[PDB]
Amino acid sequence: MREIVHIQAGQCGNQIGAKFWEVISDEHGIDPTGSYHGDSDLQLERINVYYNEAAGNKYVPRAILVDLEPGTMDSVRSGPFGQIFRPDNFVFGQSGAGNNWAKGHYTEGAELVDSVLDVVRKESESCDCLQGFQLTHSLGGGTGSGMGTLLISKIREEYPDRIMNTFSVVPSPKVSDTVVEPYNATLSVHQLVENTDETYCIDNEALYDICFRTLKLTTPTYGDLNHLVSATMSGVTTCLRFPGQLNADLRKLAVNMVPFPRLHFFMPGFAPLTSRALTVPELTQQMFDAKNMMAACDPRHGRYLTVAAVFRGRMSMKEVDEQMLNVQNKNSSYFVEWIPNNVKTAVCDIPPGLKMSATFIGNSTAIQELFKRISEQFTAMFRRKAFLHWYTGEGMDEMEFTEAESNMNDLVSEYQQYQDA
Amino acid sequence: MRECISIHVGQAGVQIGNACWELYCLEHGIQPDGQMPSDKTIGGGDDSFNTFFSETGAGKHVPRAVFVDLEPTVIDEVRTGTYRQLFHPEQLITGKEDAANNYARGHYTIGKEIIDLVLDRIRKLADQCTGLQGFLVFHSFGGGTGSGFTSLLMERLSVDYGKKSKLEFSIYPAPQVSTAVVEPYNSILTTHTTLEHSDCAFMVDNEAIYDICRRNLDIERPTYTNLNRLISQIVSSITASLRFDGALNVDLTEFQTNLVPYPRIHFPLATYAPVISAEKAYHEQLSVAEITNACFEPANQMVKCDPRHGKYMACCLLYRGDVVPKDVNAAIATIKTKRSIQFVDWCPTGFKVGINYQPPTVVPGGDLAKVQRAVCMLSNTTAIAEAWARLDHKFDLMYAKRAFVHWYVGEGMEEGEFSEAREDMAALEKDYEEVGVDS
Amino acid sequence: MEVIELNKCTSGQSFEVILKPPSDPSLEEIQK
Amino acid sequence: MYTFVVRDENSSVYAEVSRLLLATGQWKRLRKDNPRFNLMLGERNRLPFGRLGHEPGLVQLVNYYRGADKLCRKASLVKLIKTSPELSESCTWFPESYVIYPTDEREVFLAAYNRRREGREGNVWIAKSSILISSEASELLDFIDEVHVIQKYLEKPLLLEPGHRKFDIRSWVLVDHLYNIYLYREGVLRTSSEPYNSANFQDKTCHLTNHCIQKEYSKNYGRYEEGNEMFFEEFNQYLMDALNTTLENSILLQIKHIIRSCLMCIEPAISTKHLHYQSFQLFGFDFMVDEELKVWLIEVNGAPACAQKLYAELCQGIVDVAISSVFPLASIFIKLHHHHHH
Ligand SMILES: Nc1nc2c(ncn2[C@@H]2O[C@H](COP(=O)(O)OP(=O)(O)OP(=O)(O)O)[C@@H](O)[C@H]2O)c(=O)[nH]1
Ligand SMILES: Nc1ncnc2c1ncn2[C@@H]1O[C@H](COP(=O)(O)OP(=O)(O)CP(=O)(O)O)[C@@H](O)[C@H]1O
Ligand SMILES: Nc1nc2c(ncn2[C@@H]2O[C@H](COP(=O)(O)OP(=O)(O)O)[C@@H](O)[C@H]2O)c(=O)[nH]1
Ligand SMILES: [Ca+2]
Ligand SMILES: [Ca+2]
Ligand SMILES: [Ca+2]
Ligand SMILES: [Cl-]
Ligand SMILES: [Mg+2]
Ligand SMILES: [Mg+2]
Ligand SMILES: [Mg+2]
């Protein structure tokens, strides 16, 4: 198990995608021209998971950049690491998707999708042994949401034995562009429930609250939100990118984290929170704290099915084992007793501008709070058919909205079932 | 002389085989290039060490060993490591993608595509044997390859070598070093499919070895390297009778005859003493009585369980170093008057004793101190069923909710195989209770 | 306490001590 | 916060230990099937000892010794006394007992039953199991058939005045994780409220001193003392006034000797000293006293209840010496020990 193909779709997908590649290029000692100028063999050992090797020992991200408008991809091409991407891996139309899932999924997106699959196939064909795909996107807009979930369905059709992983940014009224975000998010969740193996739920509600309450940023920008996202994304991909025993490939993570196929929506967490010296007890308490979670769900309102904890930096492996055992033993009621030993811990020696950090990935039944919140915003509009004409104009029927709402309410019921068991 | 072929399956099987063959080379005076200056018969021979080593015309001593893994990264470290010249490339077999901690993926999906190649490489070793005794199989219970590939291989070896003994060295899963929540599923599925195909299986609980490394070697956080060096000492104790001149456990058949009167109850408990820190600058050397008494301490066992609360069917003591029968017999007499050693009514209350005068070899720069005498006790006690009870309970908790079962069904396994495997373990737990408990 | 089957050689010895007397699927099926 | 589970709902002693642990505020009760406990207050039957001490980062303690049943089942106790060199066939504080099935000891029991007939010795026996009294062998053996032990019946019990009435002594003993043996300083006499009648074994109310049998059948229940329960302060006054001795001298030296002999005999078999989990257990020892003030062990109870007024003190004793010794927070016992040289 080796190569991952990365796809980033729409404004959000491409902005957080670009930050992901900046952050992990710096960790692996790759400069903006794709040359290796690092000091450790640990940096290169699993470089091929995310990077292709080119002429003159250049490293090229296995990354495809997709949008229905050029603006955000022009900004990526001008951004610091913009010249590192393969130029033929930029696939863009001119129309845009007007924050409309139906345009992304059915009309504008359908026109562009075949040329994206041509690039995916080119990347896939030169892989020694493709593990699968990760997509970065938002669920609230049109391209990331509608065209992103179209791509996932087409990729599954062509690579049905490969793993599909998403970083999915969930919309919030606190950080909102349009009133239709709940429609786009409900239609997208319906796709993700069927066609991904693992979804990291990155809640703009949580990122805003962390920036405001914890980091004391009076006026959070998308840049401030994306600093949290890129640190989380570096954290949750550490085990894929560095030598290690635990969750070292996408299929092994899925087998450890997903007990039932539909319950694959993960609550990520990070410590310490940043815009000097943290102890292992403090990392462990902070990484499990509601205030460090990137999904606005109270983990004390549910139970952990499974947890992956990743510690980064030079620290005592004995103290990490003792503290991780301390959290489980002291808070035993919040870990389901019918999955024994459901908390796994990895330690990587390379830290991210920090001496030590901890990344948390939880499969909690409390994630239902995120889906219920989207469901309530959907219904408030849908009961009056408000703003539907934007969607019926692109050929969709009301029934497709009724089905998406039911499937998302079913997902909520299923989390509730295992919470009570 | 009668050859044994060693088969190392998956990461645990391969890394433990690395440690064992390193130790065998040091015990027999074999250099990393395969040369053995003390061997005067160039290019062949029927010495006791030839059970485990073949010989080329150029004086190279080559392990009678196959290494199999479904991903390449662990076997690639054998291919480029210190003992790279010892093994011919065709002994080292790798696929491209692993079984992802899934028995069904190892057994059905990936097993089906590599099984004919592995049997072909085994057949090549078998064809150079004049009197093949059979196989020593090293694997984890917990991994997808260790569990699923091994059970397919054991079934195919029963078909292709029906008269051959098969001995297992099995790593039983411990949460302090485990990499998968589903290890109990994989353990029960492999035990069910393998049970009829194995003559004698030595289980090593990673929890017991972990604690021995922490307590007796003062390692704060043991790695696989620490665990494997200790496991290789115990494996070497067990296989020494096949590799050196002697009259006890001299062929694989004799393991079954001496340790396994009932075919399904074929899991002897290993206990090893003494384990002493190399860093310990002052060490008082332990007597025959002290190391023999330490064989009845749960803290020295390869599986934590309480033999006082079961019955013995068989007991072997395998001594290495400065030991004479007089001191063994005096040690045993003292222990009989002080410990709860109860044999079943249908077996003699007795010990088979082997002494090899060469003291235990240690790997230079390792964690183990050089000692003047050591012992491995192999006892077939009903107490080892505690380890089945623990695994069966974890299996039942998860299976009652069908947690993770869809990963196994998705590989083409039927749900029915879970309940059939579990029923076989219920019958095994019951067999141990019938032999072990009074009424 | 009887000591029996005493075997001695240059590299070691073995013996037995008694403290008391007593009271498959085919290639075809796999492929399928 | 130390954690504990409760797996025996019907134990009055451990319901009170449970209440005391919670009231310290430093102990949290978990659901019965949660494995992440420090302390198991275990079930009576098929306690899963094989699943204890395999939780990393938890020191685990259980309130039962695995193998203690050898002492606490009638058949097992008889076998253990005859066959253990340190107790021996010639043991002087256990009544002559034989195991009898419907292996067996019928023809060895009949042989000894004839020596009494032969020599005109008092020849009354008692059949019981985990109850009939007769001087005729073939009526005991007929009843069994309709696993038991036949035990010489003590024909000359000590009798309390007033009332000419039989009794047994219950002693409570706590064995901690280090195998210290603690005798609770308060015992209890379970009295008969009927005068003793050596010419009528058919009437079993004046012969059997159990708290349930006297509460239903006896028409004098509570006449002499509250319950049918005389405590040590009064029984000691009685022995001083009537017989010119003490409870310590006449009876308790023998009780302490017997408790120490029974528990030191099974220590190599049940000790948790070098084990991956640890045990303690509360035992109930039941004694008879004969008219010469010789003490006889009748049985050992592995799951005793307590006298109502001693629950408070004994249960606090259990948290103090058994639990807080292993799990310290932020004496009512005599420690039985003797190191004589020879
Ligand atoms: N003692 C010991 N245990 C090991 C070692 N490597 C892995 N394990 C244990 O083996 C189990 C995991 O099985 P592995 O052998 O890694 O898995 P595999 O057979 O390679 O199977 P897949 O990777 O699933 O294809 C866990 O219980 C690990 O703790 C090792 O070198 N020594
Ligand atoms: N050998 C003997 N001689 C005289 N009386 C005897 C006796 N064995 C038993 N008893 C009488 O029977 C009573 C105890 O019976 P036994 O101990 O067998 O029953 P049991 O187990 O129900 C009591 P517990 O509730 O303490 O367990 C004593 O109190 C005594 O009165
Ligand atoms: N965290 C984060 N959220 C964003 C960013 N850009 C847009 N969003 C959110 O993404 C959603 C809008 O989708 P967007 O990606 O702009 O539309 P698209 O280009 O049609 O996919 C809304 O929920 C916004 O709150 C960003 O850079 N970071
Ligand atoms: Ca067009
Ligand atoms: Ca030779
Ligand atoms: Ca066979
Ligand atoms: Cl054959
Ligand atoms: Mg936008
Ligand atoms: Mg592997
Ligand atoms: Mg009783």
XYZ file of C-alpha atoms in Angstrom, chain D residues 51-248:
198
model
C -9.898 -12.096 33.022
C -8.306 -10.296 36.025
C -4.935 -8.473 35.925
C -4.788 -7.978 32.094
C -5.747 -4.234 32.135
C -2.606 -2.088 31.578
C -2.342 0.873 34.022
C -4.859 -0.638 36.538
C -3.856 -2.438 39.753
C -6.779 -4.931 40.101
C -8.079 -6.411 43.388
C -10.916 -8.973 43.846
C -12.760 -9.848 47.126
C -12.324 -13.663 46.600
C -9.312 -16.002 46.670
C -9.437 -18.467 43.760
C -9.187 -22.004 45.265
C -10.641 -20.959 48.697
C -13.609 -23.341 47.916
C -11.278 -26.217 49.075
C -11.878 -24.831 52.617
C -15.537 -23.636 52.170
C -17.382 -26.777 50.797
C -18.085 -29.631 53.292
C -16.684 -32.500 51.086
C -13.523 -30.501 50.166
C -12.710 -29.532 53.829
C -12.829 -33.250 54.933
C -10.517 -34.304 52.027
C -8.115 -31.340 52.701
C -7.745 -32.224 56.442
C -7.104 -36.016 55.935
C -4.673 -35.581 52.970
C -2.585 -32.479 54.084
C 0.445 -33.571 56.208
C 0.198 -30.293 58.266
C -3.468 -31.081 59.303
C -3.209 -34.947 59.154
C -5.716 -37.847 59.782
C -4.910 -37.396 63.561
C -6.082 -33.691 63.609
C -7.675 -33.175 67.096
C -10.001 -30.139 66.522
C -12.020 -31.546 63.539
C -14.746 -34.184 64.130
C -14.202 -37.677 62.575
C -15.777 -37.115 59.075
C -16.243 -39.357 55.956
C -17.245 -38.310 52.367
C -20.237 -40.389 51.045
C -21.646 -40.380 47.443
C -25.150 -41.671 46.516
C -13.998 -41.141 45.744
C -16.423 -42.693 48.350
C -15.591 -43.748 52.011
C -18.644 -45.980 52.921
C -16.783 -49.197 53.997
C -14.158 -47.140 56.003
C -17.083 -45.295 57.777
C -18.890 -48.624 58.639
C -15.563 -50.111 59.982
C -15.184 -47.192 62.507
C -18.997 -47.221 63.243
C -18.526 -50.891 64.433
C -15.657 -49.969 66.903
C -18.254 -47.821 68.848
C -20.973 -50.576 68.810
C -18.142 -53.023 69.851
C -16.841 -50.887 72.790
C -20.270 -49.444 73.936
C -19.057 -45.860 72.962
C -21.598 -43.043 72.157
C -22.380 -43.714 68.453
C -24.456 -40.688 67.150
C -23.475 -39.175 63.721
C -24.765 -36.271 61.494
C -25.243 -36.405 57.680
C -25.078 -32.994 55.862
C -24.159 -31.348 52.485
C -23.499 -27.941 50.732
C -29.707 -32.658 57.585
C -30.349 -35.820 59.744
C -28.961 -37.044 63.165
C -29.134 -40.828 64.072
C -27.261 -43.536 66.112
C -28.259 -46.063 63.320
C -25.876 -46.275 60.275
C -28.344 -47.681 57.635
C -30.881 -44.771 58.204
C -28.180 -42.098 57.442
C -27.060 -43.961 54.218
C -30.752 -44.449 53.091
C -31.382 -40.633 53.517
C -28.258 -39.608 51.448
C -29.377 -41.772 48.447
C -32.890 -40.200 48.867
C -22.785 -35.584 47.617
C -22.856 -35.611 51.505
C -20.556 -36.036 54.578
C -21.240 -38.144 57.718
C -19.547 -36.392 60.708
C -19.390 -37.629 64.347
C -22.085 -35.622 66.233
C -20.794 -33.876 69.401
C -22.851 -35.666 72.121
C -21.469 -33.535 75.056
C -21.809 -29.850 73.962
C -21.211 -26.981 76.421
C -24.658 -25.797 77.666
C -25.480 -22.161 78.613
C -27.408 -21.628 81.938
C -30.143 -20.626 82.312
C -31.930 -22.758 79.639
C -29.637 -25.865 79.356
C -29.171 -24.787 75.667
C -26.679 -25.566 72.817
C -24.803 -22.945 70.653
C -22.126 -22.439 67.924
C -19.510 -19.629 67.581
C -19.156 -17.604 64.337
C -15.713 -15.902 63.912
C -15.113 -13.460 61.010
C -11.663 -13.580 59.408
C -10.254 -11.265 56.703
C -7.231 -12.401 54.619
C -5.624 -9.388 52.842
C -3.599 -9.341 49.555
C -0.341 -9.966 51.548
C -1.948 -13.037 53.273
C -2.108 -11.331 56.685
C -4.864 -13.191 58.613
C -7.068 -10.755 60.612
C -9.573 -12.137 63.193
C -12.383 -9.583 63.866
C -12.444 -9.042 67.688
C -16.309 -9.383 67.777
C -17.656 -12.911 67.287
C -21.266 -14.111 67.888
C -22.859 -17.143 69.617
C -25.895 -18.433 67.629
C -27.854 -19.957 70.594
C -30.658 -22.535 70.887
C -33.747 -21.203 72.776
C -34.747 -24.867 73.607
C -33.142 -27.074 76.304
C -30.843 -29.850 74.885
C -32.407 -33.388 74.695
C -29.890 -36.291 74.103
C -32.787 -38.915 73.922
C -34.735 -37.226 70.997
C -32.762 -36.385 67.754
C -36.105 -36.527 65.763
C -36.825 -32.994 67.221
C -34.123 -30.847 65.482
C -34.871 -27.332 66.991
C -32.822 -27.980 70.226
C -29.956 -29.637 68.181
C -29.501 -27.156 65.182
C -28.516 -23.556 66.151
C -28.964 -21.774 62.728
C -30.648 -18.279 62.810
C -33.419 -19.351 60.308
C -34.326 -22.701 62.082
C -34.719 -21.050 65.577
C -36.721 -18.077 64.090
C -39.460 -20.410 62.626
C -39.734 -23.664 64.725
C -38.543 -22.605 68.276
C -41.297 -21.140 70.591
C -38.691 -19.308 72.813
C -37.016 -17.150 70.041
C -35.560 -14.077 71.872
C -36.314 -15.150 75.507
C -32.645 -15.028 76.739
C -31.025 -12.519 74.269
C -31.920 -10.228 71.260
C -32.102 -12.488 68.162
C -30.580 -15.795 69.321
C -27.287 -13.814 69.485
C -24.995 -13.599 72.591
C -21.908 -11.357 71.976
C -18.397 -11.853 73.475
C -18.675 -9.319 76.402
C -21.652 -11.284 77.934
C -20.306 -14.801 77.059
C -16.964 -13.791 78.704
C -18.901 -12.549 81.812
C -20.761 -15.923 81.772
C -17.472 -17.947 81.625
C -15.937 -15.872 84.504
C -19.070 -16.094 86.776
C -20.019 -19.777 86.101
C -16.736 -21.599 85.111
C -13.990 -19.317 86.600
C -12.111 -18.708 83.258
C -12.119 -16.272 80.279
C -13.196 -16.419 76.610
C -9.500 -15.645 75.657
